[PDB]
Structures are given as structure tokens and as C-alpha cells.
Amino acid sequence: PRPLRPVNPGKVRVGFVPEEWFTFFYNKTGVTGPYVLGAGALTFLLSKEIYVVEHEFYTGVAIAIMGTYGVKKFGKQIADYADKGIGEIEQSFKEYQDSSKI
Amino acid sequence: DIDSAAKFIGAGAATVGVAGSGAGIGSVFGSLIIGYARNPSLKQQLFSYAILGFALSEAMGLFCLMMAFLLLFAF
Amino acid sequence: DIDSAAKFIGAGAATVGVAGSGAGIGSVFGSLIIGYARNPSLKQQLFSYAILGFALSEAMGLFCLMMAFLLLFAF
Amino acid sequence: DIDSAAKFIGAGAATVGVAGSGAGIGSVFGSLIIGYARNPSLKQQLFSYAILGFALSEAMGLFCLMMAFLLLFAF
Amino acid sequence: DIDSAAKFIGAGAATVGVAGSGAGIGSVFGSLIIGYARNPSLKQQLFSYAILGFALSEAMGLFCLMMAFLLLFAF
Amino acid sequence: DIDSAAKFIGAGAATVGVAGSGAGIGSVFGSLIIGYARNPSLKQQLFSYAILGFALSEAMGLFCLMMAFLLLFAF
Amino acid sequence: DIDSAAKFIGAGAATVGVAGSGAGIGSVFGSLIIGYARNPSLKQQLFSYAILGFALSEAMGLFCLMMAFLLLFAF
Amino acid sequence: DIDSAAKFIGAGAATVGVAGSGAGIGSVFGSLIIGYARNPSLKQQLFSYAILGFALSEAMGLFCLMMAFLLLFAF
Amino acid sequence: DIDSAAKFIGAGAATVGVAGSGAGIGSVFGSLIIGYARNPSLKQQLFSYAILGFALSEAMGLFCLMMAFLLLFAF
Amino acid sequence: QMAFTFAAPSQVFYNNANIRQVDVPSFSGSFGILPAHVATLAVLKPGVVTVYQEDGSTKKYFVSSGTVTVNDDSSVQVLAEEAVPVENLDLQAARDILSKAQSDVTSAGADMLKLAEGQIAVEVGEALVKAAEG
Amino acid sequence: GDYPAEYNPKVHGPYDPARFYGKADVPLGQVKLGELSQWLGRRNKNPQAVAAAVSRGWWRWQHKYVLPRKGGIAPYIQLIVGCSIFFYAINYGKMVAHRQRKYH
Amino acid sequence: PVFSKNAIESADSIAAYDSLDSDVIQSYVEYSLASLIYYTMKENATSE
Amino acid sequence: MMASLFSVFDPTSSFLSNWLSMLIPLLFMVMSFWLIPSRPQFLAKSVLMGLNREMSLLMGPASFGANILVIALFLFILFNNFIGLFPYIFTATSHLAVTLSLAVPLWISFILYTWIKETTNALAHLVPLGTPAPLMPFMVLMEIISNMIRPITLSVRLAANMIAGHLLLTLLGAQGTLENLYVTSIVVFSQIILLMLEFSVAIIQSYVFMTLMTLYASE
Amino acid sequence: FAPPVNVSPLIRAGRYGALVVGIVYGSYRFGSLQKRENEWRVEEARRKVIRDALNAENKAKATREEMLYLAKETGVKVPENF
Amino acid sequence: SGRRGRHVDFGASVDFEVHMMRRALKPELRNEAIKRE
């Protein structure tokens, strides 16, 4: 098998969770299944003191809010800037091949 | 008396922050003199920034004076 | 109390760096007046640099006020 | 006499605010030399502004002089 | 107790060493406003040098802050 | 015997205030050099205001040293 | 017990001078900002002298910090 | 024993006041460099005025150090 | 024993006053940078004055070391 | 890369020639110029403009007045009233005019305009004394 | 540090660090749990084998979230939460020593 | 074209030029005028 | 205004020790497979090639190919300050051994290479230039003390920023309550301002330490 | 998203059945510990007051010893009360 | 300055400055440079 480069990465919901996890429960507990298990697990860890809500939790919230604001504000510009550099490399390589043939 | 001595020493050590406001006032009002010798026609907005400079330098001087009373009467 | 006196003496000597905020604010806001004495039409862009200078200088002011609280209720 | 002893130390540590008057007066009146070296035509407008700066800078020195007496014969 | 009491006093005396870091910060960021006022076309390179100035300015105050943290609950 | 002890510490801490006179004098005579380098034709007028700067800074410094003597013989 | 205890008081007051080192470093690098708006062609030679200015400025803070380590555990 | 102890703390506090002469000397010889970098033909009267600033700043510095000995061996 | 503890506070207090030498050294080397930005052909005379500026400001710094050494093992 | 246009009503010295350093005595301070200098302009004063080309050659050009302008495109336009090399000048003549200027100052009296002219010639004479004896 | 000896460029083609280049074994996904003991005992537990198994899994994850052209921030958020979750369980002893509820 | 001191201060691109005060601009303008007039006088005399 | 807590620097809190907290930047390294790079590879390549161009003015012949070490030192510092601010990760830079590894071996590398190559110039760096005879000896002794303990303060500087940064964040977090919306929002917004300061200083501290080592490897 | 597909008619019954069981066990345990919390807090408060009163007397003794040690160190006069 | 303070134009200052410069051109270039009007 020749490894072919895909164009888009794997589908992802809620920012980071794989969609392959969410679609894994569709045939048994439907779409609402993974969200129900995630909500129940979050409730269980908070209630049974497994997740210690200490001072670092507020820092974890502050990072999450800052990260969401920073990515949503500058993500399009950076991704376009990176895709611009990729296109210039692709143009440079295809022009080399055409110039060598000519 | 021992905790009264702590309040008086703590107040006398917290009232040195007004020295920095004394320097910060001198810097802004000092730079105002130079900034008004060059291009004196901008007097009104120059004076506004000078008052803005005073309204933050002296105000942070009162930040320590508030802590001076916080070590004197309140706590 | 002896240890209560140590907290108060530390807190009073923790208010020292408020003077540094006053000097840092007075330097930035004064130098803004000279920087604005030329180019009066460059008000808004240069104002952003000064508030950045004010925010960092006042961040040092709250940095010293951090140890003021630590020697008042924490240690 | 320990409470009076702490007040003597507290007032003695409160008279360091005169250093704020020294630097502010020195910086303002030094800047007046630069501001009067060039453009001496406005030597009355600049001098009036510097005396205003000197008065506010020296007011902080009188603030700490008051605080030294406020820990001396006020409590 | 008295050993711990003097550890808190030395921690407060170590908090003194942050005011001058606030002074150096205000000097760099104030002069940055002048630096951007004179020839604003060098905005990015001058900002890099002033940020380099801020890197060493607060770090000198952090030495005393770490010394304050050493005498707070580390010594 | 702690009243004489408190006077010794207080007068020592009061004598720090002459530092602000030291920095101010070094500032005004520093700016006198810049003032003399730019338009030296007003040498005596600039030097006259320089002495007025010296007579308003060192006077505050010796005002603080006077308070040091008062903290040893009046307070 | 008060020997190492007051050594910790002295050590906190010994590391004060790094503040002025921070003020000194900001003075050098702030003046590099004004000194680079004019004459960018001397970037390397001005920076090398500014580094020597920075090195001698940070040497003073380390000079005080070594004195703080001298009284901490070096006896 | 108390009197010798408190004189030792007081003389230590009185030795801070030479810092401003340290900043003032570093200020006046700073602006001497600027004042000589512009119109160097006046080196004779510039250095005459610059040594006037040094002979006044360091004099206030020795004024503090003279008072340090007065609280170390005289009183 | 009390004289041992009082020597330690005073020796630490004596090293408070080296911050001014720290700031002034940055001032004289900062103004070297501006003074050598313009007028680059006076490098030998400007840098020789920066050495003289450093030689006198650190001399005040070593005067702090002399009194710190005087209050650590001499007296 | 520093274009030099040092001209005069009498002579012409440089025309878009690459110079490493030119030090100019101006009313805003006797500062110096390097390529890609500060965008500014200043007024000349009696003093010794110096030229240090790409070969490091030192040439001294005393002027009596003029203008100095540095633009953002690293273009230097120094125009001076009468620029001459200082080798064709006399220190004895410089002090003779200086002594003549001092006589004008002393004999000015209530003539404040003549007092200004004596002061102006004093500045020119003192500039040439340092120029010729250096 | 070299290419694995089981790799053959003639049959497979160019090397791909996310593909297992040994004998084609039946993966654990389709094991009906009656062969679970046989499958676990068959796969060796060498430090070399598990290190190669980690890298073959890591490059599989790179092939799904980074190596595609339009790779977003999702892998770099997944790593941060993944490391935070893993390091919270490590520091569980210090965290649970404080807690919030006395009974819970 | 010949401009005035007041017009020079009000110029949009004059902010990029530094070291500008009243006396510097006034003296530079009144000497730039006497350098443009001298340039035209030489051009006019040769053309005439 | 309630309380405070500390001691987030225990390497052996569990039997899987906190040495794995140093092996986390190996994950974030951009492993490259394709010819045309991906988006994060090009971003990392552009940043590093940008830093190499900026440091090219200060390289010199003695650091002819040591820029890889300087850049690797930069990325190691950045990933030990950025990762130290995420909540449930022990502060690796707080441990002095990380700072010992950061400053001591490279300083000994630079001072011994300077001493072997240019011994007189190394001693002349311990004196201010153009120093007369009566001004010589006290400047030499203090600068000898300066150059001996300067990298030790560099190690202290790298430690103290993240120690003070994490102490401030833990202080702000511990003085807040989940139930009170006003206190939680104030605590969260205060930490966001503090994190923006702490993220900014962490990048700048890594940038200055690259600049300082590039200057001190040039000589 | 994907179209909805109904859950198997055994997951729902197990889910809600466990939901009801958790509610009644939650009510039973909470009430049992509420009585336990009330009786434990009362006896904890009583022994805390007695312990704090004894610790206050010990702290008063230690502070006077510390104040006595300070006056011995400073060499100042010792008052009748302290 | 002194010139503006005495209300003297810079052009008049220029002519005074150049006349004093020309009077110090003793050896050969005084007559050649000064062509009068």
C-alpha cells in the first residue's frame, strides 16, 4: 500500500475529542450516548471527590478561556499564513520541474 | 503594646511609598517643562497628559497610604 | 504577639515597592509628554505604548502588594 | 515607654519621604535648565509650570512630614 | 518563634528590592514612547530592544522576590 | 533605656532622607551640563536657576537631617 | 537563636541593591531605545557598549546578592 | 549593651542615605557625557560644572556617612 | 548576643544603600549610549568619561561595602 | 550607500558619493552622520564639517553657515554658505578677526545690534581658532 | 536506531512508521474474547517490542491529526488535556490529601 | 515651489523629520529660500 | 483573603515519579514525514529559521555551528516555562537541578573555551576597558566575583520567574470559592490577566537567555 | 448530525431503574449521615472549645516566656506585670 | 538665541559669517573668491 497524504485530518467534536469515539456509541445508545456518559462521568468525579477542586482548577479554567479566545481570534490568520507558505513551496517545486523539462 | 508597636513600625515602614510618588510627580512635571519648551502651541493637551500623569502617579502614592492606615487602625 | 509583630513589620516593609510603581508610572507618563510634544497627530498610537508601560509598572505595584497580603494573612 | 519607643522609630522611618521631595525638586528644576536653555521667550510660562511641579513634589514631602508627626503626637 | 519571627522580618526587607525593578521598567517603557515618537518606522526593532530591556529589569527584582520567598516559608 | 535605643534607630532611619537630596543634586547639575551644552550664551542665567535648584533640593535634605537631630534631642 | 535569625534579617536587607541594578539596567536599555531611533547603523557597537553597561549594572546587583549570601550561610 | 546594639542598627540605617549620592553621581556624569557629546569645545567649563555637581552630590553622601559614625562612636 | 543580632540588621541595612550606585551606573552608561549614538567620532572621550562615571558611582557602592564590612566584623 | 551632496555657492565637493561618516556642527548639537541616519534637518553653525569616505580618508571642511538635511531615503544634502578646506586658513587671521570682534563688542555700548554682530564675529573667530590650530 | 529488519522496501514500498512491518497479525479488535488469552500471550512483552508498539501508535496518531495538510489545533489541545489527565492521576496523592468535603 | 515656515510645520510628512523646533525650522526655511533663489538666478542668467 | 498553599515541587509523589514531567516536550516536537510540510511543521520551521536569521548577526566564528545548541536551549526553556503554567503539572523549573543543568555546564563550556583560546582577553574582560592604575584592583576583584556568580544568577532567574508565577496563580486560586459567582469571576479574570503576563514573560525570558548565550558564545 | 436511532428496549429500563435506586439510596444515606454529621459536629465543637481554652492558656504561658526572653535579650527593665 | 533675541535675520547672520570667513583667506583665495557683485 502506497501511503497517500489525506487533505483533512480526523473529524473532531468539542474541540479535541475524536469523532470516532462519539460515533462508536451510535449503534447502541445513539447520538446522546457519549454526551450522557461524559456528563455522568464529570458529575461522578466531582461528587465523589475524585476530582479535587483546588486552586489549580481556576487556573485550568483561565487557560481554557484564554485558549478559546486566542484560537478563535487568530486561528484563521495563522492557518492562512501557513497555507500561504505551503503554496509557495508547492509552486516552487512545480516550477522547478517545468523549468527542467523545458 | 507589642501589637501596638507592630502597627506603629508597620505604618512607619509603609509610608515610604510616597517617596516614589514624589519622584513620579517630579518626572512628569519635569518632562512637562521640556515638552512645553518644544512646540508650546500644544499647551492644552500637554497639560491634560501632565494632569493624567499626576492623576496616576499620586494615586498610586495613596495606594501605600491606604495600606498605611490598614496597618494603623483597620488591622 | 511576637509572630504577629513579624507579620506587620514584613507587611510595612512589603509596601516599599509601591514607590517603584510611582517612579515607573511617572517615568512612562512623563516621557509620553515629550514623545507627544512632537507629532501631536500621533496621539492614539503612542498612547497605547504608555498604557502598556503603565500596566507593566502597575503590575510591579501589585507584585509588591502580593507580599503585602502574604505578610498580612498568609505568612 | 515601649509604645512611645515604637512611635519614635515609626516617625523616624516616616521621615524618609523627604527623599521623594529631593528627587522631584532636583528632576524638575534640572529639566527647567534644559527647558530654559532653548526657547527662553516663554521663560515665565515654563517657570510657572515648574513651580507648580515643585509645589506638588514638595507636597508629598510635607505629607510624610505630617505622617511623622501623626505617629508622634496624634495617637 | 523568634527565629521564625526574624525570618518574616528579613522577608519583608527582601521585598524592598522590587521598587528599582519598577523604576527600570518605567525607564525603558517611557523611553520606548520617545523611541517610537522619533522615527516611527523602526517600531518593531525598537519594541524588541525595549522588551529585551524589560526582560532584565523585572528579573533583578525577582532575585529579591525569590529571596523574599526563601525567607517566607523556605528558610 | 529603650527610649535612647529607639532614638538611635530612628535617627539612623531618618538620615536616609538625605539620599533624595543626593539624587536631586546629581540630577540638576547633570541637566545643567545639557543646558550649558545647548545655547551656552545664557550661562549665568542658567547657572542662577541651577543654584536655585540646589537651594531647593539640599535644603530639603538638610531639612531631613534637622529632623534627625530633633529625633535625637526633641523626640 | 537570634544569630542566624538576625542574619536572615540582614540577608533580606542586603539583597535590596539588586533593585537599583534593575533600575540601572532599564536606564541603559531605555537609553538604547532613544539611541537607536537615531543612528541605526551603529547597532552593534552601541549594543556592545550597552551590554557592558548592563554587565556592570547587573554586577552591582550580584554584588549585593553575594553580600546577602555572605550573611545567609557563608559564616 | 542595649545602647551599643541600637547604635549598630541606627548606623546601619544611616548608611542607606549615601545611595542617592550614588544615583546622583551616576546621573551628573551621565549627562556630562551627553553634554560633551554635543558641542565638545566647551569641555573646560563643562567639566568645571560637572565637578561642581560631583562635589555637591558626594558631599551629601559623606554627610550621611559622617552621621553614620556619629551614631557609631560619638553618641 | 544582642550585639551579634544588632550587627546583622545594621550590616543588612548598610547594603540597602548600594541600589543607588546600581541605578547611577546604569544612568552614566545609559547616557553613554545616547551620547555615542550621535557624534560617533568622540568615542574615546565619551567612553573615558563613562569609566570615570562608573569609577565614582561604584566608589559610593564600595563605601556601602566598607560600612557593611565595618558592621559585620569590625564593629 | 549614503548619498552626499555637499555643495556651496563657491565650490562643489561631493555629488551622491558614498561616505562612511560626516560630522556636522549644527545648532542642534555638533552631531555626526552615518548611512541610513535619522530623518531630520538642522541648521549649520560656524565649525569644522569633517568627511570620512569609504576609504577612511579624513578631510576637514570649515564652513561659515548653511543647512543640513537627512531624508528617509539615506540622502544627505549639506549646503553651506562658503565651504573651504581648513588648510588654506590662518590662525593669525582668525585671532585678528577675533580681536577685531572683541573691539566691536567693547565699542558697541548701547548699540545692541552692533553688540550682536560682535558676538557673531566672536563665534566665527573662536570657531576658526580651534579649526586652524587643530 | 535504524529501520526495523522486518521492513522490506520491495514488497511494501517506502517506509511508513505507522504501519506494522512484521507478519500480518489479526488485531485485538476482532478477537472474540475467547482468543484473548492466546492473543495476549502470543504478543511478546520485550522493552523493544513495546517501544516499537508505542512509536507505531504515535505515528498512527500523527497520521490522523497532524500529518494531513489542514491540521488544526485539535491534536495540540488533545495532548494538553491528555498530559493534564495523566499527571493529575500521578499527583493524586497530594491532591486527595486536601479535598473539600469532610464526609462526601 | 517655495513654502513658508507655517506651511512647513503643518506638513503631513514633516513629522518624520526630527529635531524640529521653531528656531531650527525658521532658519532652515529662510536659508532654503535663499538657496532656491540663487539656483533660479543662475539658471535664469544662463538661459538669458 | 482566605488562605494559601505551596509545595507543588515534589518529584516522587507517586511511584511513577515526576521525571516524566521533563519527558513531555518530546511529545510536542514536530516530527516530520512528508516532503511538503504540515501546518505546525511550517510554523515551527519558520520560527526557528527566523531566530537563526536574527542570531546570525551575533554568531561569530567561535560559535560557527553551536547555534543548534543555543536554539535547543531556547526550546527547552520555553517548554519548561509554558508547560509549568498548566494546572496539574509540577513546576519543573522550580527544581534547581533543571536550572543547574541550564546554566552550569554551558557556562563552564564558555569560560574554559575562552580561557584556553584567549586567556589575556578573558582576564581583560574582568577589568573595565581603559581603567587607570588607582582604579584597577577593586574593579578587577568585584568583576571576578561578578563573572563567577553571573551564570548562577541566570539559573536563579529562570527558576524565580516560574516560582513567583506559580505562587501567584496558586494564591489567586486558593482565595476563591466556587459557589460565589462574584468571587469566581474576579478570580478567573485576575488569573487571565496574570496568565497573559506570565505567558509574555516566559517567552521573553527564553528570548533573552538565547540572546545572552549567543553573545557569550560569540566571544 | 446523524439521524436518531432508538435505543434498545433494555438500556433504558436499566438506566432509569438505576436512576431511581440512586435517588432512594441517596436519600437514605444523606439522612443517615445528616444525623451522623449533627451528632459528630456537636461533640467535635465541645472538645474543640475545651482544647482551644487549654491551648489558649498554653499560648499565654509561652508568650510570657517569649516576652521574658525578649527583655533578657534587650536588657531593658522588666515591669511588674511583664 | 542671541541672533533672534536681537531680532537679526539668519540671512544677515549668514553674510556676517561669510565675511569673517573670507577675511581669513589671506594667502591667495581672498580676491578670487570675492567677486563683489
Numbering used by the authors:
A (entry chain K): 1 to 102
B (entry chain 3), C (entry chain 2), D (entry chain 4), E (entry chain 1), F (entry chain 5), G (entry chain 8), ...: 1 to 75
J (entry chain H): 15 to 148
K (entry chain R): 3 to 106
L (entry chain G): 173 to 220
M (entry chain N): 1 to 219
N (entry chain T): 3 to 84
O (entry chain I): 11 to 47
Q: What does the published report state?
A:
We obtained three cryo-EM maps for the A. franciscana ATP synthase, purified at pH 7.0 for the rotational states 1, 2, and 3a at nominal resolutions of 2.6 Å, 2.6 Å, and 2.7 Å, respectively. State 2 was the most prevalent in this dataset, which we selected for further analysis. The final local refined maps for  F1 and FO at state 2 had nominal resolutions of 2.6 Å and 3.9 Å, respectively. The F1 and FO local refined maps were combined to generate the composite map of A. franciscana ATP synthase. In the maps of A. franciscana ATP synthase (state 2), each non-catalytic nucleotide-binding site in α-subunits is occupied by an ATP molecule with an accompanying Mg2+ ion. The catalytic nucleotide-binding site in the βTP subunit has ~50% occupancy with ATP and ~50% with ADP, based on the weak density of the gamma phosphate present on this site. The nucleotide-binding site in the βDP subunit is occupied with ADP, and the site on βE is empty in all the maps. The intrinsic inhibitory factor IF1 is present in the A. franciscana ATP synthase maps for all three rotational states (state 1, state 2, and state 3a) in the pH 7.0 dataset. In A. franciscana ATP synthase, IF1 is localized at the interface between αDP and βDP subunits in all rotational states. The N-terminal region of IF1 (residues 4-20) is unfolded in A. franciscana ATP synthase structure.
ATP synthase is a unique molecular engine that uses the rotation of its subunits to perform the catalytic reaction of ATP synthesis and hydrolysis. Unlike in mammals, mitochondria of the crustacean Artemia franciscana have the ability to accumulate large amounts of Ca2+ without undergoing the mPT. Here, we performed structural and functional analysis of A. franciscana ATP synthase to study the molecular mechanism of mPTP inhibition in this organism. We found that the channel formed by the A. franciscana ATP synthase dwells predominantly in its inactive state and is insensitive to Ca2+, in contrast to porcine heart ATP synthase.
